[PDB]
Amino acid sequence: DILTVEKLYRPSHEYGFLRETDTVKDYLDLVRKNRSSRFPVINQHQVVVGVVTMRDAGDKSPSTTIDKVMSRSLFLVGLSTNIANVSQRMIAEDFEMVPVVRSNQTLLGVVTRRDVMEK
Ligand SMILES: [Cl-]
Ligand code: NA
Numbered sequence: 001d002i003l004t005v006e007k008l009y010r011p012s013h014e015y016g017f018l019r020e021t022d023t024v025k026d027y028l029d030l031v032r033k034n035r036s037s038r039f040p041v042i043n044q045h046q047v048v049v050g051v052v053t054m055r056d057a058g059d060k061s062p063s064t065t066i067d068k069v070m071s072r073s074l075f076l077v078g079l080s081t082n083i084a085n086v087s088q089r090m091i092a093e094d095f096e097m098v099p100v101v102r103s104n105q106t107l108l109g110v111v112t113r114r115d116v117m118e119k
Helices: 024-034 083-093 113-118
Strands: 039-042 048-052 097-101 107-112
Touching: 039 097, 039 107, 048 097, 083 113, 107 113
Parallel strands: none
Antiparallel strands: 039 048, 097 107
16 A cells, blocks of 8 residues: 555644653643644653553643653554554554654654544
C-alpha cells in the first residue's frame, strides 16, 4: 500500500506535546489552547516515555509532574508505517492518537483517528 504515516501525521508543535517535567496545570492549559486531550510525553532526550490523557490527569493535583500521572505508550509508528495497519489497531484497541517516532524512539508528532479514518 502507498498510503503511509508520513502523508497524514501532525508534527509535534502543531498537535501538542508535553515534557515529563511539565505539570498537570501545563497539560490542562494545553488542552484549552489546542482543543485536544491526548498528548505524547517526552523526556530530556526527546524520547517518548508515555502518553497523557484526561483520564490520567483530570483529577490530579495541578502541581504534579506529568511523569507521575502519564500512561504507558506501547503503540508507536514511523513515517514508513502503512496507514491500513494503523487503522486496524486504532479500531481494534480504540485509540484516538498514536505517537510517530524516529528509529531511536524520539518524537516526530502524532497521527489522529479522524485523519486516518477520513483518509
Ligand atoms: Cl488514544
Ligand atoms: Na488542535
